[PDB]
Design a protein around this ligand. Structure first.
Ligand SMILES: *[C@@H]1O[C@H](CO)[C@@H](O[C@@H]2O[C@H](CO)[C@@H](O)[C@H](O)[C@H]2NC(C)=O)[C@H](O)[C@H]1NC(C)=O
Ligand SMILES: *[C@@H]1O[C@H](CO)[C@@H](O)[C@H](O)[C@H]1NC(C)=O
Ligand SMILES: *[C@@H]1O[C@H](CO)[C@@H](O)[C@H](O)[C@H]1NC(C)=O
Ligand SMILES: *[C@@H]1O[C@H](CO)[C@@H](O)[C@H](O)[C@H]1NC(C)=O
Lengths: 650, 130, 610, 119
């Protein structure tokens, strides 16, 4: 019963090649299969929307990777835009071998795919994060193709007013891949937040937008920041940790501010209303630009009693602290508001978004948990207790408890032995003590009586740097079928960038060299056939950010005591010829009242690269189809297909 | 040795609903006296309720502002002759919304609050000179 | 003291000073002249290369600072001829006492308290600051560049200066006028409305004029499984093949227009095309010499099946690039079967009347005439644009003659529900004259039957067939007016039943009806509201355009008098124009809510006195 | 982007020599222009940069007031007047092209310049 498999990402983006994978299954070793793959929309009499490709996969080398060019002109010619019931395009493989040999109803096999015109990466860079009306705004947009290489397509950049009204629309050819423009804010502009949006002209929903706030400001001379002692305030009954906070005022040039800090406290709930305290305002002289102030337990209780709020009512209210530091004898004042004190019972926060659901009976259930300190960076050495209660369909549900400590990066990889008879597994995790942060989730075993299950095991369990080959252990947990090989592929940014097969053995170790093509994360989908049905199990792999390979290094000759009017030579170093874009900003502008939105950094860049990721979740799936769906794959084996994604997002 | 008389009142019933901070600025060339200032605070009836004076700048935190007009004063010590005759300034801020300032001016005892400037219906010129 | 020229002057205080994009050959050195501002310059980069790609750089926190620096923070908004106070603060980070001499230079348009460069002395000790108040009133009109000079003592000289441009706002506050207006392009009245010109007496004749216009625009299927199962393989005699072919084409076309092929596997679509091709061949070989399309070659022709085949085959002609001239012959044969008055005889009835639909009954001639006319119109598409001209002209003549007959028969009334429905659709499809179209449509209205919410006409084969034809007529008759929406809903429920569409004629017609309705509702127009502004301003006559196909828009226009509006398009939106001018406003100078009064008593020494 | 410069020649100190260079091949009113001195043994320290529009100008502390820059977009010509020439100013001055008025790249677009000399 020879079979042909057809793989491609669940979404095809217009204007960029679509990676399609095909591999023969259970061939008699004596015949070759030829054909081609193309994209056609049946609403227009099956008019092809993409040139065909050389299918030509031999029996000796079943696996083959195909790149379907999808030009924009072909999409228009076959009329995708005329579609009404959402975007839908069919990808089919044409090969007479299906009809003559397999005796199928027709010599065509395909998959239903969604599509969108979102293509390439666009990044905008405003002159400064905040403008006052009447000034000249400067901005530029970087056009990058899907491979993060500079592009040259026409773009349309439009500025939206604070009210959402377009005040500019420039359609510009940008062969240099960088476009520099500059307009002027109306003097009568009311304070608010504007928005600059750009998109490739050919595409329609390929837009990326940056926002700049406009308000009537005057450049502050010093910036005051309220740094608390602890990001969290325990509110458990009986125990209420003291609320001590530190106030720091510093001149932008760095020297300390000698003034007086007038502080007012209040409770700020979700909606935004503030319930200020009366008589609780503490003002102290800033000594060396530092002013420690704390609220004692007794007096704070009285203040709450005055408002009759009560401790029990401090569920999630945010303690609002505003300081009005007046520098003396300077006179000017700058206000800083603290909006990060959450009254939380649990000092720690357990993030269980990295634990894959759909446990595989007969193989260890690796439980991943990120122990991030509440309102802070990940912490280390926080014991975590896991109490898994495997459900026995025909016996008492055994209670298994395992304890482990954080590795040091905030993550704990705690295996859990699970017998093959379990109907479902219920586990509760608690991190740290006293008052541990508890998170509870229940995972149900897939339905029994089906084909075998495949379990991916990663011995390392640490984030792989680029250039580090990580090994995955593949094991067939079900019946001992005689499948010869293991087929696996790597999905990075909704693209099948590598497909291969590894022969079955007593030990199955697959080396996956991780390169920049796999960043900031990828999927590892591997499968085998138990006679006729497929079996698969994906495994999302979070790759470390590392750094960009461009290697741009801004540097000066130290000695940060430059007196104005002095010549400072800036050394620009890059590993290759490149376009360098430079912005020298005043740190005060970050102090000027605003949301302090961060600039463009590699964290945001990799978010753009990962923004095209189609798979949702850590991986795994109850059925072979579901794991392919969750992985962001479109799959069809002739007798079994994958339903098209109902939306562009999971 | 010069004696100040700072006075603050409030029509009230709208807007403020809170205390105030005084930013009284001394005439350039001298600073407020130290000892005479604390005794404003030492009293049990503590109108000023806090202070911070340094150079020609004096900061007061009037914890309460009544409807009527009150006056609290202090002396100042001089160390350099005032370079030129001009009006000084002082401001009052709202504690819970410092934007609601109240700017005013005050001259030397034998001078005037505002600069000598004759103004017509449309054009105004200065007569500042000997 | 220190010479005013000797001390450097700080005047370039940019908020951003490095906005260049340049090419680097893996190494480039660019010299920077730091602006005369004492802050921290957060230099950031962004490298874009054709080989590697985007690579953000680590910001270089450049701190620029001076030991003894003078800070001058001018207020954002200053009025003319109003008391203004300058408080340039001197910072002394040096480890020695300083005796400074702060004085604002005598710049024209500014009114210093002393009236000139009168040195003011202040004692600023090490690690401390002393403000030096300087009271001015701005007498200028546009802007004045005032510099501050701090001269140290002879024995210990330390210089510093700062220069800034103080822009003075024009007299009067800021006044904005809001003129909310609507836009009703469909409306026949008020289309070319006008905006009254500004006439506020308080408007200052001499001042800055700015105007703006803001325009907005605020806008207010059958189961795939059932239709897919109808793709049955054609077989049987020349008649039974059509029963299995027309639904196959109808379902194939219904899914085509409704765009429901995504739900079904892609192998189903090409399975359908194969069935159409196979069914196309099967019926082709049953064709007679003159395109009769009879059930058996021995059996004589039946125009009903010939008309039905022409309709079915003509529709499929797009899928299959078959021979069209064969149909042209068939259409020609139909004309030869037309009676003198315009009807069609059909001498031989089909053996199995079940597939005929609702034609069987008291009256058949009226329905048959309309049915043939529908098929004949469908056959107009297949006619080649070149050749067969006289055959085509005969078709329009014959159809019109039959079309004229239908209106005469329809106007007589006393016809069954089925006949009225078919004629109603036939009249509309064939582009009948309006007079006959209206009477037929009116007759259908009265005969329409309802029994509940969106209830019209499982139901028996007759009612389901009749409603389907009506739905097409309503859709073609002045669009859908909440009648097709209701009637189509009835079909959707009727067709969703298990084994729905019992008969064959109802299936092909009903599937076409829902498909026609579905494509009608999910239809998006351009939705434009483009407007133009016309006025005769002082500078002359100016025009503007605001395309709003698809959102809101703003635009700055140089008009200061009465302006004219020209709405267009079809989308309704709101237009409101903003005019900004300065007005003569004067309020109390003193504080309103909180008031502070300070008085000074004593003796103050002086150096230079008036 | 040719930058032709002229007006050099040895001059006795106090001669108030004038240097002028005209540019072509680009929009002059959109690009910042500068002068750069190149001492025989030292590096490049760039004297003055006349603003894009022509109002704002800067001068090195060694020439502040002594020299005077000027431009005019109409003729695409830019001038520099060296009042009270000091015999240490002897060098080769080459007007430079740059952007953003504060920083000049090493070899973005530099002219030839003339070697001014002093007896
Ligand atoms: C591209 O523009 C569209 C405009 O619709 C953005 O989609 C929505 O835009 C509205 C504003 O009109 C937002 O309020 C919504 O939150 C946006 N999302 C959705 C799902 O409606 C879209 O986000 C833009 N693309 C970007 C920013 O990458
Ligand atoms: C500056 O003046 C203060 C006045 O109290 C004095 O204490 C200090 O010693 C002086 N500076 C030096 C360096 O002596
Ligand atoms: C304004 O819109 C209408 C309908 O959208 C269009 O026909 C017309 O051409 C548009 N105006 C211009 C000047 O094109
Ligand atoms: C102050 O109040 C009003 C309101 O602004 C002002 O117009 C008027 O000049 C003053 N009147 C009095 C009674 O103070």
């Amino acid at each position: 019963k020879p079979r042909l498999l057809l793989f491609s990402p669940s979404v095809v983006h217009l204007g960029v090649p679509l990676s399609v994978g095909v591999q023969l299954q259970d061939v008699p070793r004596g015949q070759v299969v030829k054909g081609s793959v193309f994209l056609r929309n049946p609403s227009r009499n099956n008019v092809p929307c993409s040139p065909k490709v050389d299918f030509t996969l031999s029996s000796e080398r079943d696996f083959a990777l195909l790149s379907l060019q999808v030009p924009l002109k072909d999409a228009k010619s076959c009329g995708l835009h005329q579609l009404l019931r959402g975007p839908e395009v069919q990808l089919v493989a044409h090969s007479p071998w299906l009809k003559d040999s397999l005796s199928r109803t027709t010599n065509i096999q395909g998959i239903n795919l969604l599509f969108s015109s979102r293509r390439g990466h666009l990044f905008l860079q405003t002159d400064q994060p905040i403008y006052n009306p009447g000034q000249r705004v400067r901005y530029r947009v970087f056009a990058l193709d899907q491979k993060m290489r500079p592009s040259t397509d026409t773009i349309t950049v439009m500025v939206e007013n604070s009210h959402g009204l377009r005040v500019r629309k420039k359609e510009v050819y940008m062969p240099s891949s960088i476009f520099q423009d500059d307009f002027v804010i109306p003097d009568i502009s009311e304070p608010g937040t504007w928005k600059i949006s750009a998109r490739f002209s050919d595409g329609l929903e390929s837009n990326s937008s940056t926002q700049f706030e406009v308000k009537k400001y005057v450049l502050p001379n010093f910036e005051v920041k309220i740094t608390p002692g602890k990001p969290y305030i325990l509110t458990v009954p009986g125990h209420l940790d003291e609320m001590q906070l530190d106030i720091q005022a510093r001149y932008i040039y760095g020297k300390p501010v000698q003034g007086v800090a007038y502080v007012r406290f209040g409770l700020l709930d979700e909606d935004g209303k503030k319930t200020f305290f009366r008589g609780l305002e503490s003002q102290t002289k800033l000594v060396n630009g530092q002013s420690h102030i704390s609220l004692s337990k007794a007096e704070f209780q009285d203040a709450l009693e005055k408002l009759n709020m009560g401790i029990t009512d401090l569920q999630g209210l945010r303690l609002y602290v505003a300081a009005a530091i007046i520098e003396s004898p300077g006179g000017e004042m700058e206000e800083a508001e603290l909006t990060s004190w959450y009254f939380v019972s649990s000092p720690f926060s357990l993030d269980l978004s990295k634990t894959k659901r759909h446990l595989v009976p007969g193989a260890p259930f690796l439980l991943q948990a990120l122990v991030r300190e509440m309102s802070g960076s990940p912490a280390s050495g926080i014991p975590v207790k896991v109490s898994a209660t495997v459900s026995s369909p025909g016996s008492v549900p055994e209670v298994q408890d395992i304890q482990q400590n954080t590795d040091g990066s905030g993550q704990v990889s705690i295996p859990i032995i699970i017998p093959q008879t379990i109907s479902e597994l219920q586990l509760s995790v608690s991190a740290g003590s006293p008052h541990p942060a508890i998170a509870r989730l229940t995972v149900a075993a897939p339905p029994s009586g089906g084909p075998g299950f495949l379990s991916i095991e990663r011995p390392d369990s640490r984030p792989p740097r680029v250039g580090d080959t990580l090994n995955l252990n593949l094991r067939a947990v079900g019946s001992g079928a005689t499948f010869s090989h293991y087929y696996y592929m790597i999905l990075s940014r909704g693209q099948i960038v590598f497909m291969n097969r590894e022969p079955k053995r007593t030990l199955t170790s697959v080396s996956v060299f991780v390169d920049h093509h796999l960043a900031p994360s990828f999927y590892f989908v591997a499968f085998y056939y138990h006679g006729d049905h497929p079996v698969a199990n994906s495994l999302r792999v979070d790759v470390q950010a590392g750094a960009c390979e461009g290697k741009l290094e801004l540097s000066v000759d130290g000695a940060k005591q430059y007196r104005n009017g002095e010549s400072v030579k800036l050394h620009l170093e890059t590993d290759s010829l490149a376009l360098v874009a430079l912005g020298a900003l005043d740190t005060a502008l970050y102090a000027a009242g605003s949301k302090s939105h961060k600039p463009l950094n590699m964290g945001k860049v990799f978010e753009a690269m990962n923004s095209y990721d189609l798979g949702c979740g850590p991986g795994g799936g109850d059925s072979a189809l579901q794991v392919f769906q969750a992985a962001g794959l479109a799959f069809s084996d002739g007798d079994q297909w994958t339903l098209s994604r109902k939306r562009l997002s999971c | 040795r010069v004696h100040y008389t700072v006075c603050i009142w409030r029509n009230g019933k709208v807007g403020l609903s809170g205390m105030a901070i005084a930013d009284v600025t001394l005439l350039s060339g001298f600073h407020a006296l130290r000892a005479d200032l604390e005794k404003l605070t030492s009293l049990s009836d503590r109108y000023v309720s806090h202070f911070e004076t340094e150079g020609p700048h004096v900061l007061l935190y009037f914890d309460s502002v009544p409807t009527s007009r009150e006056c609290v004063g202090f002396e100042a010590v001089q160390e350099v002759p005032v370079g030129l005759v001009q009006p000084a300034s002082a401001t009052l801020y709202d504690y819970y919304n410092p934007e609601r300032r109240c700017s005013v001016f005050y001259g030397a005892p034998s001078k005037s609050r505002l600069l000598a400037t004759l103004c017509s219906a449309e054009v105004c010129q200065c007569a500042e000179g000997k | 003291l220190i010479d005013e020229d000797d001390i450097p002057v700080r005047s370039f205080f940019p908020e951003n000073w490095l906005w260049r994009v340049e090419t680097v050959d893996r190494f480039q050195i660019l010299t920077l002249w730091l602006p005369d501002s004492l802050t921290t310059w957060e230099i950031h980069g962004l490298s874009l290369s054709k080989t590697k790609g985007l690579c953000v750089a680590t910001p270089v926190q450049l701190r620029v600072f001076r030991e003894f620096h003078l800070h001058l923070r001018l207020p954002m908004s200053v009025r003319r001829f109003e008391q203004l106070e300058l408080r340039p603060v001197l910072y002394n980070y040096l480890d020695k006492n300083l005796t400074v001499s702060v004085h604002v230079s005598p710049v024209e348009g500014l009114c210093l308290a002393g009236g000139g460069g009168l040195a003011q002395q202040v004692l600023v000790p090490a690690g401390s600051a002393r403000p030096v108040a300087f009271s001015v009133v701005p007498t200028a009109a546009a802007a004045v560049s005032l510099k501050v000079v701090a001269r140290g003592s002879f024995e210990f000289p330390v210089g510093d200066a700062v220069s800034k441009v103080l822009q003075i706002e024009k007299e009067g506050a800021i006044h904005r006028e809001e003129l909310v207006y609507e836009l009703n392009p469909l409306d026949h009245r008020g289309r070319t409305l006008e905006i009254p010109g500004n006439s506020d007496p308080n408007m200052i004749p001499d001042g800055d004029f700015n105007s703006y216009v803001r325009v907005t625009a605020s806008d207010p299927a059958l189961s795939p499984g059932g239709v897919a199962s109808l793709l049955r393989l054609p077989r049987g005699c020349g008649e039974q093949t059509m029963i299995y072919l027309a639904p196959t084409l109808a379902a194939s076309r219904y899914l085509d227009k409704t765009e429901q092929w995504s739900t079904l596997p892609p192998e189903t679509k090409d399975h359908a095309v194969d069935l159409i091709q196979k069914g196309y061949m099967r019926i082709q070989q049953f064709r007679k010499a003159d395109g009769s399309y009879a059930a058996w070659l021995s059996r004589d022709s039946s125009t009903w099946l010939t008309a039905f085949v022409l309709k079915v085959l003509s529709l499929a002609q797009e899928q299959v690039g078959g021979s069209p001239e064969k149909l042209q012959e068939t259409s020609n044969w139909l004309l030869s079967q037309q009676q003198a008055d315009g009807s069609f005889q059909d001498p031989c009835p089909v053996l199995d009347r079940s597939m005929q639909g609702g034609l069987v009954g008291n009256d058949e001639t009226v329905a048959l005439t309309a049915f043939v006319t529908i098929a004949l119109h469908h056959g107009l598409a297949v006619f080649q644009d070149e050749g067969a001209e006289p055959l085509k002209q005969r078709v329009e003549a014959s159809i019109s003659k039959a079309n004229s007959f239908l209106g005469e028969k329809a106007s007589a009334g006393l016809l069954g529900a089925h006949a009225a429905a078919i004629t109603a659709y036939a009249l509309s499809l064939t582009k009948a004259p309006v007079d006959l179209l209206g009477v037929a449509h009116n007759n259908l209205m009265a005969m329409a039957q309802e029994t509940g919410d969106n209830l019209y006409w499982q139901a028996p084969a007759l009612w389901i067939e009749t409603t389907a034809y009506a739905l097409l007529h309503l859709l073609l008759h002045e669009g859908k007016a909440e009648m097709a929406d209701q009637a189509s809903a009835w079909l959707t429920r009727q067709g969703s039943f298990q084994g729905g569409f019992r008969s064959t004629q109802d299936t092909v017609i009903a599937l076409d009806a829902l498909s026609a309705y579905w494509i009608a509702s999910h239809t998006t127009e351009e939705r434009g509201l483009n407007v133009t502004l016309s006025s005769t301003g002082r500078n002359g006559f100016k025009s503007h355009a605001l395309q709003l196909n698809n959102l809101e828009e703003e635009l700055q226009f140089s008009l200061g008098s009465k302006i004219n509006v020209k709405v267009g398009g079809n989308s309704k939106g709101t237009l409101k124009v903003l005019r900004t001018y300065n007005v003569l406003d004067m309020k109390n100078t003193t504080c309103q809510d909180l008031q502070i009064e300070v008085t000074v008593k004593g003796h103050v020494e002086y150096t230079m006195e008036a | 982007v040719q930058l032709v410069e002229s007006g050099g020649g040895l001059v006795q100190p106090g001669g108030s020599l004038r240097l002028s260079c005209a540019a072509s091949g680009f929009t002059f009113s959109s690009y910042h222009m500068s002068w750069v001195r190149q001492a025989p043994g030292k590096g490049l320290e760039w004297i003055s940069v006349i603003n894009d529009s022509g109002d704002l100008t800067r001068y090195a502390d060694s020439v502040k007031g002594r020299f005077t820059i000027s431009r005019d977009n109409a003729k695409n010509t830019l001038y520099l007047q060296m009042n009270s020439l000091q015999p240490e100013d002897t060098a080769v001055y080459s007007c430079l092209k740059s952007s953003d008025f504060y920083s000049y790249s090493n070899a973005d677009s530099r002219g030839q310049g003339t070697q001014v000399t002093v007896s």
